[PDB]
Amino acid sequence: FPRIWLHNLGQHIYETYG
């Protein structure tokens, strides 16, 4: 299910907030 791979990207923008 490589489609869920897009969710990983959300982890990069989340660090920008912290």
Swiss-Prot record:
Give its localization. Virion; Host nucleus; Host extracellular space
Write out the similarity annotation.
Belongs to the HIV-1 VPR protein family.
Q: How is it modified after translation?
A: Phosphorylated on several residues by host. These phosphorylations regulate VPR activity for the nuclear import of the HIV-1 pre-integration complex.
Role this protein plays: During virus replication, may deplete host UNG protein, and incude G2-M cell cycle arrest. Acts by targeting specific host proteins for degradation by the 26S proteasome, through association with the cellular CUL4A-DDB1 E3 ligase complex by direct interaction with host VPRPB/DCAF-1. Cell cycle arrest reportedly occurs within hours of infection and is not blocked by antiviral agents, suggesting that it is initiated by the VPR carried into the virion. Additionally, VPR induces apoptosis in a cell cycle dependent manner suggesting that these two effects are mechanistically linked.
Residues of the whole record sequence present = 34 to 51 of 96
In its miscellaneous comment, the UniProt entry states: HIV-1 lineages are divided in three main groups, M (for Major), O (for Outlier), and N (for New, or Non-M, Non-O). The vast majority of strains found worldwide belong to the group M. Group O seems to be endemic to and largely confined to Cameroon and neighboring countries in West Central Africa, where these viruses represent a small minority of HIV-1 strains. The group N is represented by a limited number of isolates from Cameroonian persons. The group M is further subdivided in 9 clades or subtypes (A to D, F to H, J and K).
What is the protein's quaternary organization?
Homooligomer, may form homodimer. Interacts with p6-gag region of the Pr55 Gag precursor protein through a (Leu-X-X)4 motif near the C-terminus of the P6gag protein. Interacts with host UNG. May interact with host RAD23A/HHR23A. Interacts with host VPRBP/DCAF1, leading to hijack the CUL4A-RBX1-DDB1-DCAF1/VPRBP complex, mediating ubiquitination of host proteins such as TERT and ZGPAT and arrest of the cell cycle in G2 phase.
Q: Could you identify this protein by its name?
A: Protein Vpr
